[PDB]
């Protein structure tokens, strides 16, 4: 079907498991000649050449890319995007998949995203910020309870009653941090239902849906403890109906891409909708402007289509249908004890050699030294397995995980548990 230029040098920006997953996929493309990741990490060195340049060193990255004749740059994390790498690259004539600074604002500013979804009729949790008690009060009292109250400067209360919400909102203003605008309180609609991650390739108004993943954000078994970058994920997600999926594509993803374009911020890249499946249909929690982590590690193994060709087709504004395997994929994050708090580095990791070769081991935060492996970051590794069903992928993933010994790491035993229940 689609022809593109073969023997294309590709650069991936980032250092994590998402970027291990995007490099591992890229390396399998019949289109790719040379594959660099800047800065990557020692498990990524197995699939790609590492480049010792920071993600935020935009001028070095531009100079590296001109000089090593990079045909495609794919940006992993959001900070480079929020800093204008795409803008710099385009002005230099370098081809890049990722949003402009102005488009990436959809993730950077939750206020801006709320503002855009309100103006364009996009379903989401109601959101409002106040520096006045009396105005906070009058608003809490129209909206009623349960209600989220958020204090700046733990400070998140899901107030079960109106009286509690007011007590919490009053405290937020009296004890929260005094910014240059005074103290402020954030009030949000509480939503119930099942969370899901809906990513799509986007170029302007053109939206190309990926598979649907579910992430597990809480640190501990039974969705306990604080929130994290994500402790595991799987795809597909059988308890989210096709109808909910289509509602979210037509009432959320397609209108956000339009809204960004209508505001003179067209988006190019991965638009990642963090969603709730409510009784009333799907509702935005947040938007992200790039692949989710650990969502990329579980979605990208299911993609049949060549990843580099799909990116090029998207950048060209070409027609494309993405093809996916029937097999489910589930992934478990091993994190350094203490994460998402203060965590210890430098614990020896044994047993990486013992893992079956069809297991997918995505390095996020490891170091290699004197021929051994050590923890070096909050999320350290993700192990995913494929399975004919979700339960089989769950079984495979956990069985393989147990080959790893590290007294400095922990992981959730309940990834996927509800979905199989
Ligand atoms: N309005 C909401 N309704 C339900 N869950 C939420 C809401 N906001 C945040 N969360 C949860 O808290 C996590 C952290 O997102 P955030 O609160 O924007 O940092 C999300 O990934 C959700 O799992």
CSV table of C-alpha atoms and ligand atoms in Angstrom, one decimal:
chain,number,residue,atom,x,y,z
A,1,UNK,CA,0.0,0.0,0.0
A,2,UNK,CA,2.0,3.0,1.2
A,3,UNK,CA,5.5,3.7,-0.2
A,4,UNK,CA,8.0,5.8,1.9
A,5,UNK,CA,11.7,6.3,1.8
A,6,UNK,CA,13.7,3.4,3.1
A,7,UNK,CA,17.1,3.7,4.9
A,8,UNK,CA,16.0,6.5,7.1
A,9,UNK,CA,17.8,7.6,10.1
A,10,UNK,CA,15.5,7.9,13.1
A,11,UNK,CA,16.0,9.6,16.4
A,12,UNK,CA,13.9,8.9,19.5
A,13,UNK,CA,13.9,11.5,22.3
A,14,UNK,CA,13.8,10.2,25.9
A,15,UNK,CA,15.2,7.8,28.6
A,16,UNK,CA,12.3,5.6,29.7
A,17,UNK,CA,10.3,2.4,29.1
A,18,UNK,CA,8.0,4.2,26.6
A,19,UNK,CA,11.1,5.2,24.6
A,20,UNK,CA,12.5,1.6,24.9
A,21,UNK,CA,9.1,0.5,23.4
A,22,UNK,CA,9.1,3.1,20.6
A,23,UNK,CA,12.8,2.2,19.7
A,24,UNK,CA,12.2,-1.6,19.8
A,25,UNK,CA,9.2,-1.1,17.4
A,26,UNK,CA,11.1,1.3,15.1
A,27,UNK,CA,14.1,-1.1,14.9
A,28,UNK,CA,11.8,-3.7,13.3
A,29,UNK,CA,10.7,-1.3,10.5
A,30,UNK,CA,12.0,-2.3,7.0
A,31,UNK,CA,12.2,1.6,6.5
A,32,UNK,CA,14.8,2.2,9.1
A,33,UNK,CA,18.5,2.4,8.6
A,34,UNK,CA,20.0,3.9,11.8
A,35,UNK,CA,18.1,4.4,15.1
A,36,UNK,CA,19.4,6.7,17.8
A,37,UNK,CA,17.9,7.5,21.2
A,38,UNK,CA,19.0,10.6,23.2
A,39,UNK,CA,19.7,9.9,25.9
A,40,UNK,CA,18.1,6.4,26.3
A,41,UNK,CA,19.4,4.0,28.9
A,42,UNK,CA,21.4,0.8,29.0
A,43,UNK,CA,18.4,-1.6,28.0
A,44,UNK,CA,17.6,0.7,25.1
A,45,UNK,CA,21.3,0.3,23.9
A,46,UNK,CA,20.3,-3.3,22.9
A,47,UNK,CA,17.9,-2.1,20.2
A,48,UNK,CA,19.5,1.4,19.3
A,49,UNK,CA,22.6,3.6,19.5
A,50,UNK,CA,22.5,5.9,22.4
A,51,UNK,CA,23.3,9.6,22.1
A,52,UNK,CA,24.5,11.4,25.1
A,53,UNK,CA,22.4,14.6,24.8
A,54,UNK,CA,19.8,15.7,27.3
A,55,UNK,CA,16.1,15.8,26.1
A,56,UNK,CA,15.9,19.5,26.9
A,57,UNK,CA,19.2,20.4,25.1
A,58,UNK,CA,17.3,21.5,22.1
A,59,UNK,CA,20.2,23.2,20.3
A,60,UNK,CA,22.5,20.1,20.6
A,61,UNK,CA,19.6,17.9,19.4
A,62,UNK,CA,19.0,20.2,16.4
A,63,UNK,CA,22.8,20.1,15.7
A,64,UNK,CA,23.0,16.3,16.2
A,65,UNK,CA,20.0,15.8,13.8
A,66,UNK,CA,21.3,18.0,11.0
A,67,UNK,CA,24.7,16.4,11.2
A,68,UNK,CA,23.6,12.7,11.5
A,69,UNK,CA,21.1,13.4,8.7
A,70,UNK,CA,18.0,12.4,10.8
A,71,UNK,CA,15.0,11.8,8.6
A,72,UNK,CA,12.5,11.4,11.5
A,73,UNK,CA,12.6,12.5,15.1
A,74,UNK,CA,10.0,11.0,17.5
A,75,UNK,CA,9.7,12.7,20.9
A,76,UNK,CA,8.9,10.6,23.9
A,77,UNK,CA,8.3,12.8,27.1
A,78,UNK,CA,6.4,16.0,27.3
A,79,UNK,CA,9.0,18.5,28.7
A,80,UNK,CA,10.9,18.8,25.3
A,81,UNK,CA,7.5,19.4,23.7
A,82,UNK,CA,6.6,22.1,26.3
A,83,UNK,CA,10.0,23.7,25.6
A,84,UNK,CA,9.4,24.0,21.9
A,85,UNK,CA,11.6,21.2,20.3
A,86,UNK,CA,9.0,20.8,17.6
A,87,UNK,CA,9.1,24.6,16.7
A,88,UNK,CA,12.9,24.6,16.7
A,89,UNK,CA,13.1,21.4,14.6
A,90,UNK,CA,10.5,22.7,12.0
A,91,UNK,CA,12.3,26.0,11.6
A,92,UNK,CA,15.5,24.1,11.0
A,93,UNK,CA,13.8,22.0,8.4
A,94,UNK,CA,13.9,18.8,10.5
A,95,UNK,CA,11.0,16.3,10.3
A,96,UNK,CA,9.5,15.6,13.8
A,97,UNK,CA,6.5,13.9,15.1
A,98,UNK,CA,5.1,15.8,18.1
A,99,UNK,CA,3.1,18.9,18.8
A,100,UNK,CA,4.2,22.6,18.8
A,101,UNK,CA,4.6,24.3,22.1
A,102,UNK,CA,1.2,26.0,21.5
A,103,UNK,CA,-0.6,22.6,20.8
A,104,UNK,CA,1.3,20.9,23.6
A,105,UNK,CA,-0.4,23.3,25.9
A,106,UNK,CA,-3.3,20.8,26.0
A,107,UNK,CA,-1.2,18.8,28.5
A,108,UNK,CA,0.9,21.6,30.1
A,109,UNK,CA,-2.0,23.6,31.4
A,110,UNK,CA,-5.0,21.8,32.9
A,111,UNK,CA,-6.7,25.2,33.0
A,112,UNK,CA,-6.2,25.7,29.4
A,113,UNK,CA,-7.6,22.2,28.6
A,114,UNK,CA,-10.7,22.9,30.8
A,115,UNK,CA,-11.1,26.3,29.1
A,116,UNK,CA,-10.9,24.7,25.6
A,117,UNK,CA,-13.3,21.8,26.4
A,118,UNK,CA,-15.9,24.2,27.9
A,119,UNK,CA,-15.7,26.5,24.8
A,120,UNK,CA,-16.0,23.5,22.4
A,121,UNK,CA,-18.7,21.4,24.4
A,122,UNK,CA,-16.2,18.6,25.2
A,123,UNK,CA,-17.4,16.4,28.0
A,124,UNK,CA,-15.2,16.6,31.1
A,125,UNK,CA,-15.3,17.2,34.9
A,126,UNK,CA,-16.5,20.7,35.8
A,127,UNK,CA,-13.5,22.7,37.1
A,128,UNK,CA,-13.1,26.0,38.7
A,129,UNK,CA,-10.6,28.0,40.7
A,130,UNK,CA,-11.1,30.6,43.3
A,131,UNK,CA,-9.2,33.0,45.4
A,132,UNK,CA,-12.4,34.3,47.2
A,133,UNK,CA,-13.9,32.2,50.0
A,134,UNK,CA,-17.4,33.6,49.4
A,135,UNK,CA,-17.2,32.8,45.6
A,136,UNK,CA,-15.8,29.3,46.3
A,137,UNK,CA,-18.7,28.9,48.7
A,138,UNK,CA,-21.5,30.0,46.3
A,139,UNK,CA,-20.1,27.6,43.7
A,140,UNK,CA,-19.7,24.6,46.0
A,141,UNK,CA,-23.5,25.2,46.9
A,142,UNK,CA,-24.7,25.1,43.2
A,143,UNK,CA,-22.8,22.0,42.4
A,144,UNK,CA,-23.5,20.0,45.6
A,145,UNK,CA,-21.6,16.9,46.9
A,146,UNK,CA,-19.6,14.6,46.6
A,147,UNK,CA,-17.1,17.2,45.3
A,148,UNK,CA,-13.2,17.4,44.8
A,149,UNK,CA,-11.5,20.3,46.7
A,150,UNK,CA,-7.9,20.8,46.0
A,151,UNK,CA,-5.4,23.0,48.0
A,152,UNK,CA,-2.1,24.3,46.7
A,153,UNK,CA,0.9,24.0,49.0
A,154,UNK,CA,-2.8,15.3,50.8
A,155,UNK,CA,-4.3,18.7,49.9
A,156,UNK,CA,-7.0,16.7,47.9
A,157,UNK,CA,-10.2,16.2,49.7
A,158,UNK,CA,-13.2,14.3,48.1
A,159,UNK,CA,-15.8,16.0,50.3
A,160,UNK,CA,-18.7,13.7,50.8
A,161,UNK,CA,-21.1,16.5,51.9
A,162,UNK,CA,-21.5,20.3,51.2
A,163,UNK,CA,-20.5,21.2,54.7
A,164,UNK,CA,-17.3,19.2,54.5
A,165,UNK,CA,-16.5,20.8,51.1
A,166,UNK,CA,-16.8,24.3,52.6
A,167,UNK,CA,-14.7,23.4,55.6
A,168,UNK,CA,-12.0,22.0,53.2
A,169,UNK,CA,-12.3,25.0,50.7
A,170,UNK,CA,-12.0,27.5,53.6
A,171,UNK,CA,-8.9,25.6,54.9
A,172,UNK,CA,-7.4,25.6,51.4
A,173,UNK,CA,-7.6,29.4,51.2
A,174,UNK,CA,-6.5,30.0,54.8
A,175,UNK,CA,-3.6,27.4,54.9
A,176,UNK,CA,-2.6,26.8,51.3
A,177,UNK,CA,0.4,28.5,49.7
A,178,UNK,CA,0.3,32.3,49.1
A,179,UNK,CA,1.1,32.8,45.5
A,180,UNK,CA,1.7,36.2,43.7
A,181,UNK,CA,-2.1,36.2,43.1
A,182,UNK,CA,-2.9,35.2,46.7
A,183,UNK,CA,-4.0,31.7,47.8
A,184,UNK,CA,-6.3,29.8,45.6
A,185,UNK,CA,-8.6,26.8,45.8
A,186,UNK,CA,-9.4,24.3,42.9
A,187,UNK,CA,-12.9,22.7,42.9
A,188,UNK,CA,-13.6,19.8,40.6
A,189,UNK,CA,-16.6,17.5,39.8
A,190,UNK,CA,-16.2,14.1,41.3
A,191,UNK,CA,-16.7,11.5,38.6
A,192,UNK,CA,-17.3,7.8,38.9
A,193,UNK,CA,-16.8,4.9,36.6
A,194,UNK,CA,-14.0,3.1,34.9
A,195,UNK,CA,-10.8,5.0,33.8
A,196,UNK,CA,-9.3,4.3,30.4
A,197,UNK,CA,-6.6,5.7,28.2
A,198,UNK,CA,-7.5,6.5,24.7
A,199,UNK,CA,-4.5,7.5,22.4
A,200,UNK,CA,-4.7,8.4,18.7
A,201,UNK,CA,-2.2,9.7,16.1
A,202,UNK,CA,-3.3,13.2,15.3
A,203,UNK,CA,-2.4,15.7,12.4
A,204,UNK,CA,-4.6,18.7,12.6
A,205,UNK,CA,-8.2,17.5,12.3
A,206,UNK,CA,-7.2,14.0,11.2
A,207,UNK,CA,-7.5,11.5,14.0
A,208,UNK,CA,-6.2,7.9,13.9
A,209,UNK,CA,-7.3,5.9,17.0
A,210,UNK,CA,-4.9,3.5,18.7
A,211,UNK,CA,-6.0,0.7,20.9
A,212,UNK,CA,-7.5,1.4,24.3
A,213,UNK,CA,-5.4,0.7,27.4
A,214,UNK,CA,-6.1,0.8,31.1
A,215,UNK,CA,-3.4,2.2,33.4
A,216,UNK,CA,-3.2,1.6,37.2
A,217,UNK,CA,-2.1,4.9,38.8
A,218,UNK,CA,-2.2,4.2,42.4
A,219,UNK,CA,1.0,2.8,44.0
A,220,UNK,CA,-0.3,-0.2,45.8
A,221,UNK,CA,-2.5,-3.3,45.5
A,222,UNK,CA,-6.2,-2.6,45.6
A,223,UNK,CA,-5.7,0.9,44.2
A,224,UNK,CA,-4.2,2.2,47.5
A,225,UNK,CA,-1.5,4.8,48.3
A,226,UNK,CA,-0.6,7.9,46.4
A,227,UNK,CA,-0.9,8.4,42.6
A,228,UNK,CA,2.1,7.6,40.4
A,229,UNK,CA,3.2,7.8,36.7
A,230,UNK,CA,1.5,4.4,36.3
A,231,UNK,CA,2.1,1.0,37.9
A,232,UNK,CA,1.0,-1.2,35.1
A,233,UNK,CA,-1.4,-1.4,32.2
A,234,UNK,CA,-3.0,-3.7,29.6
A,235,UNK,CA,-4.8,-3.6,26.3
A,236,UNK,CA,-7.5,-4.2,25.1
A,237,UNK,CA,-9.9,-3.3,27.9
A,238,UNK,CA,-13.0,-5.6,27.5
A,239,UNK,CA,-15.1,-3.9,30.2
A,240,UNK,CA,-15.2,-0.6,28.2
A,241,UNK,CA,-17.9,-1.0,25.6
A,242,UNK,CA,-17.3,-0.3,21.9
A,243,UNK,CA,-20.0,2.3,22.3
A,244,UNK,CA,-18.1,4.1,25.0
A,245,UNK,CA,-15.0,3.8,22.7
A,246,UNK,CA,-16.9,5.3,19.7
A,247,UNK,CA,-18.5,8.0,21.9
A,248,UNK,CA,-15.0,9.0,23.1
A,249,UNK,CA,-13.6,9.1,19.5
A,250,UNK,CA,-16.5,11.2,18.1
A,251,UNK,CA,-17.4,13.4,21.1
A,252,UNK,CA,-13.8,13.8,22.5
A,253,UNK,CA,-10.8,13.0,20.4
A,254,UNK,CA,-12.1,14.4,17.0
A,255,UNK,CA,-13.6,17.5,18.5
A,256,UNK,CA,-10.3,18.3,20.6
A,257,UNK,CA,-8.2,18.0,17.4
A,258,UNK,CA,-10.7,20.3,15.7
A,259,UNK,CA,-10.7,22.7,18.7
A,260,UNK,CA,-6.9,22.9,18.8
A,261,UNK,CA,-6.8,23.6,15.0
A,262,UNK,CA,-9.6,26.2,15.2
A,263,UNK,CA,-7.6,28.0,18.0
A,264,UNK,CA,-4.6,28.2,15.7
A,265,UNK,CA,-2.8,25.4,17.5
A,266,UNK,CA,-3.2,22.4,15.3
A,267,UNK,CA,-1.7,19.3,17.0
A,268,UNK,CA,0.6,16.8,15.4
A,269,UNK,CA,1.7,13.7,17.4
A,270,UNK,CA,0.0,11.4,20.0
A,271,UNK,CA,-3.0,12.9,21.6
A,272,UNK,CA,-3.6,10.9,24.8
A,273,UNK,CA,-7.0,11.2,26.3
A,274,UNK,CA,-7.1,10.1,30.0
A,275,UNK,CA,-10.8,9.1,30.3
A,276,UNK,CA,-13.6,8.1,32.6
A,277,UNK,CA,-16.4,5.8,31.4
A,278,UNK,CA,-19.3,7.3,33.4
A,279,UNK,CA,-23.1,6.4,33.3
A,280,UNK,CA,-23.4,9.5,31.1
A,281,UNK,CA,-20.8,8.5,28.6
A,282,UNK,CA,-17.0,9.1,28.5
A,283,UNK,CA,-15.5,12.2,30.2
A,284,UNK,CA,-12.1,13.8,30.0
A,285,UNK,CA,-9.9,13.7,33.2
A,286,UNK,CA,-6.8,15.1,31.5
A,287,UNK,CA,-5.2,15.3,28.1
A,288,UNK,CA,-1.6,14.4,27.4
A,289,UNK,CA,0.4,15.5,24.3
A,290,UNK,CA,2.5,12.3,23.8
A,291,UNK,CA,2.5,8.5,24.3
A,292,UNK,CA,1.5,7.4,27.8
A,293,UNK,CA,3.9,5.5,30.0
A,294,UNK,CA,3.2,2.6,30.6
A,295,UNK,CA,0.6,2.7,27.9
A,296,UNK,CA,3.1,2.7,25.0
A,297,UNK,CA,4.7,-0.5,26.4
A,298,UNK,CA,1.4,-2.3,26.2
A,299,UNK,CA,-0.2,-0.8,23.1
A,300,UNK,CA,2.7,-0.7,20.8
A,301,UNK,CA,3.3,-4.5,21.1
A,302,UNK,CA,-0.2,-5.0,19.7
A,303,UNK,CA,0.3,-2.8,16.7
A,304,UNK,CA,0.7,-4.9,13.5
A,305,UNK,CA,1.2,-1.9,11.3
A,306,UNK,CA,4.7,-0.8,10.9
A,307,UNK,CA,5.2,2.1,13.5
A,308,UNK,CA,7.5,4.2,11.3
A,309,UNK,CA,5.3,3.9,8.2
A,310,UNK,CA,2.2,4.8,10.3
A,311,UNK,CA,3.9,7.9,11.7
A,312,UNK,CA,5.0,9.0,8.2
A,313,UNK,CA,1.5,8.4,6.8
A,314,UNK,CA,0.0,10.5,9.6
A,315,UNK,CA,2.6,13.3,9.0
A,316,UNK,CA,1.6,13.2,5.3
A,317,UNK,CA,-2.0,13.5,6.1
A,318,UNK,CA,-2.5,10.1,4.3
A,319,UNK,CA,-5.3,7.6,4.7
A,320,UNK,CA,-4.4,4.7,6.9
A,321,UNK,CA,-6.2,2.0,8.9
A,322,UNK,CA,-4.1,0.6,11.8
A,323,UNK,CA,-4.2,-3.2,12.3
A,324,UNK,CA,-3.8,-4.7,15.7
A,325,UNK,CA,-3.3,-8.3,17.0
A,326,UNK,CA,-6.1,-10.2,18.8
A,327,UNK,CA,-3.7,-11.0,21.6
A,328,UNK,CA,-3.9,-9.0,24.8
A,329,UNK,CA,-0.8,-7.5,26.4
A,330,UNK,CA,-0.4,-6.7,30.1
A,331,UNK,CA,2.6,-5.0,31.7
A,332,UNK,CA,3.9,-4.7,35.3
A,333,UNK,CA,6.1,-1.9,36.5
A,334,UNK,CA,8.9,-2.7,39.0
A,335,UNK,CA,9.6,0.6,41.0
A,336,UNK,CA,12.2,1.5,43.5
A,337,UNK,CA,10.9,1.1,47.1
A,338,UNK,CA,9.6,4.4,48.3
A,339,UNK,CA,8.4,5.6,44.8
A,340,UNK,CA,6.4,7.9,44.2
A,341,UNK,CA,8.2,9.3,47.2
A,342,UNK,CA,11.9,9.4,48.0
A,343,UNK,CA,13.4,6.1,46.7
A,344,UNK,CA,16.8,4.5,47.0
A,345,UNK,CA,19.1,4.0,44.0
A,346,UNK,CA,21.8,1.4,43.4
A,347,UNK,CA,20.2,-1.9,44.4
A,348,UNK,CA,21.5,-4.8,42.4
A,349,UNK,CA,19.0,-6.4,40.1
A,350,UNK,CA,19.5,-10.1,39.4
A,351,UNK,CA,17.8,-12.4,37.0
A,352,UNK,CA,17.3,-10.3,33.9
A,353,UNK,CA,18.9,-13.1,32.0
A,354,UNK,CA,16.4,-15.7,33.3
A,355,UNK,CA,13.4,-14.0,31.6
A,356,UNK,CA,11.8,-15.9,28.7
A,357,UNK,CA,12.8,-14.4,25.3
A,358,UNK,CA,9.2,-13.6,24.3
A,359,UNK,CA,8.7,-11.6,27.5
A,360,UNK,CA,9.0,-7.9,26.8
A,361,UNK,CA,11.3,-6.1,29.2
A,362,UNK,CA,11.2,-2.4,28.9
A,363,UNK,CA,14.0,-0.6,30.9
A,364,UNK,CA,12.9,2.8,32.4
A,365,UNK,CA,15.5,3.6,35.1
A,366,UNK,CA,18.4,1.0,35.3
A,367,UNK,CA,22.2,1.4,35.3
A,368,UNK,CA,24.8,-1.1,33.9
A,369,UNK,CA,28.1,-1.3,35.7
A,370,UNK,CA,30.9,-3.8,36.1
A,371,UNK,CA,28.7,-6.3,34.2
A,372,UNK,CA,25.8,-6.0,36.7
A,373,UNK,CA,22.4,-4.2,36.7
A,374,UNK,CA,21.3,-1.6,39.4
A,375,UNK,CA,18.3,0.4,40.1
A,376,UNK,CA,18.6,4.0,39.1
A,377,UNK,CA,15.2,5.8,38.9
A,378,UNK,CA,11.7,5.6,40.4
A,379,UNK,CA,10.1,3.3,37.8
A,380,UNK,CA,12.9,0.9,36.9
A,381,UNK,CA,11.5,-1.7,34.5
A,382,UNK,CA,8.2,-2.9,33.0
A,383,UNK,CA,7.6,-6.5,32.1
A,384,UNK,CA,4.8,-7.2,29.6
A,385,UNK,CA,3.6,-10.5,28.2
A,386,UNK,CA,1.3,-11.3,25.2
A,387,UNK,CA,-1.6,-13.7,25.7
A,388,UNK,CA,-4.4,-15.2,23.7
A,389,UNK,CA,-6.6,-13.7,26.4
A,390,UNK,CA,-6.1,-11.1,29.2
A,391,UNK,CA,-5.9,-13.8,31.9
A,392,UNK,CA,-3.2,-15.6,29.9
A,393,UNK,CA,-1.2,-12.4,29.4
A,394,UNK,CA,-1.7,-11.7,33.2
A,395,UNK,CA,-0.5,-15.2,34.1
A,396,UNK,CA,2.5,-15.1,31.7
A,397,UNK,CA,3.6,-11.6,32.9
A,398,UNK,CA,3.5,-12.5,36.7
A,399,UNK,CA,5.2,-15.9,36.2
A,400,UNK,CA,8.1,-14.2,34.4
A,401,UNK,CA,8.3,-11.3,36.9
A,402,UNK,CA,9.2,-13.7,39.6
A,403,UNK,CA,12.5,-14.5,38.0
A,404,UNK,CA,13.7,-11.1,39.1
A,405,UNK,CA,15.4,-10.6,42.4
A,406,UNK,CA,15.9,-7.2,43.8
A,407,UNK,CA,15.4,-6.2,47.4
A,408,UNK,CA,15.3,-2.6,46.2
A,409,UNK,CA,12.2,-3.0,44.0
A,410,UNK,CA,8.5,-3.7,44.4
A,411,UNK,CA,5.5,-4.2,42.1
A,412,UNK,CA,1.7,-4.6,42.2
A,413,UNK,CA,0.2,-8.1,42.1
A,414,UNK,CA,-3.2,-7.0,41.0
A,415,UNK,CA,-2.5,-5.5,37.5
A,416,UNK,CA,-5.5,-6.6,35.4
A,417,UNK,CA,-7.3,-8.2,38.4
A,418,UNK,CA,-10.7,-6.3,38.1
A,419,UNK,CA,-10.6,-6.6,34.2
A,420,UNK,CA,-10.5,-10.5,34.6
A,421,UNK,CA,-13.2,-9.9,37.4
B,1,LIG,N1,-11.9,14.4,38.3
B,1,LIG,C1,-11.4,13.2,38.5
B,1,LIG,N2,-12.3,12.1,38.7
B,1,LIG,C2,-11.8,10.9,38.9
B,1,LIG,N3,-10.5,10.6,39.0
B,1,LIG,C3,-9.6,11.6,38.9
B,1,LIG,C4,-10.0,12.9,38.7
B,1,LIG,N4,-8.9,13.7,38.6
B,1,LIG,C5,-7.9,13.0,38.8
B,1,LIG,N5,-8.2,11.7,39.0
B,1,LIG,C6,-7.3,10.5,39.3
B,1,LIG,O1,-6.0,11.0,39.8
B,1,LIG,C7,-5.0,10.7,38.8
B,1,LIG,C8,-4.0,11.9,38.8
B,1,LIG,O2,-4.5,12.8,37.8
B,1,LIG,P1,-4.4,14.3,38.4
B,1,LIG,O3,-5.3,14.4,39.7
B,1,LIG,O4,-4.8,15.4,37.2
B,1,LIG,O5,-3.0,14.5,38.8
B,1,LIG,C9,-5.7,10.5,37.5
B,1,LIG,O6,-4.9,9.7,36.6
B,1,LIG,C10,-7.0,9.8,38.0
B,1,LIG,O7,-6.8,8.4,38.1
